[PDB]
Write a protein that binds this ligand. Structure first.
Ligand SMILES: [Au+]
Ligand SMILES: [Au+]
Ligand SMILES: [Mg+2]
Length: 282
């Protein structure tokens, strides 16, 4: 018909349409880069200072599929969306709660229970596969992240990539996961600076934890091994980092951004939902 959106791995979807609608879509999914005018690619090169999330390969970051409806409504377009794109996890709230009740989570030697909002956030994320979980730094996000990784670990064979803001937090995240008792250290590889003690060299570990600066220096192919990826404080991530590894996560069915400070009024908010999915506030 007018627009046909096909599945194309878990990083992007492919759009089929006319050359005319393509240019409309290309302008629609673009934004002004902050600081262009100082960029020599604009001052002397072929760049117009705008970031295009829809490339000429007609590929659009997965997380932005939902926004295409805004477009089609505006230009009166009719579109078919590959059903595989809107696919949700077959997990009923009933079975989720059942799954949660079999877990024995701890805090030192004292057993603890996740809060209702933590349970809701985890459930929302799993069912919908990818979301920007908008929760306050107090929402004890490490447990939300631990539950999300545990779930994936039990149901899929890939690996889990967790991106944190600093090397100190890399160690803290790994320690938290083990304190909960949902994971053991042999199961968590820390990469980069505080990258495990001399302990690493554990490339069989399902969970990989690092910072953006380390992660961005990895080969594109390195990201194919991940089925789930999380970035705590995703509002601190740059567009350069995101656009740098997004295509590499072609098998990353689950993707989550956690943040209490979203960039609602920033021009680039578009590429955070393109990388992490729609926003969800508990
Ligand atoms: Au549409
Ligand atoms: Au974010
Ligand atoms: Mg949005």
């Amino acid at each position: 018909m007018d627009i046909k959106v096909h599945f194309h791995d878990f990083s992007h979807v492919r759009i089929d349409c006319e050359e005319s609608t393509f240019h409309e879509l290309r302008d629609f999914f673009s934004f002004e880069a902050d600081g262009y005018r100082f960029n020599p690619r604009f001052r002397y090169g072929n760049w117009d200072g705008r970031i295009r999330l829809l490339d000429y390969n007609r590929l659009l970051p997965f997380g932005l599929v939902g926004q295409i409806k805004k477009f089609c409504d505006n230009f009166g377009y009719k579109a078919w969306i590959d059903p595989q794109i809107n696919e949700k996890e077959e997990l009923s709230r009933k079975d989720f709660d059942e799954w949660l009740s079999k877990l024995e989570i701890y805090s030192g030697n004292k057993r603890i229970e996740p809060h209702w909002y933590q349970k809701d956030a985890v459930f929302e994320g799993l069912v919908n596969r990818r979301r920007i979980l908008n929760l306050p730094t107090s929402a004890g996000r490490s447990l939300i992240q631990a539950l999300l990784a545990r779930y994936y670990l039990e149901n899929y064979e890939g690996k889990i990539l967790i991106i944190v803001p600093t090397t100190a937090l890399t160690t803290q995240m790994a320690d938290d996961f083990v304190d909960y008792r949902l994971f053991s250290h042999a199961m968590i590889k820390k990469i980069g600076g505080g990258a495990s003690k001399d302990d690493k060299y554990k490339n069989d570990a399902p969970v990989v934890v690092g910072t953006w600066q380390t992660v961005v220096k990895q080969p594109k192919e390195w990201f194919s091994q991940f089925g789930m990826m999380m970035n705590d404080e995703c509002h601190l991530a740059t567009g350069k980092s995101i656009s740098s590894i997004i295509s590499g996560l072609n098998n990353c069915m689950f993707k989550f951004g956690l943040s209490g400070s979203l960039r609602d009024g920033k021009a680039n908010i578009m590429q955070y939902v393109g990388m992490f999915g729609e926003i969800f506030k508990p």
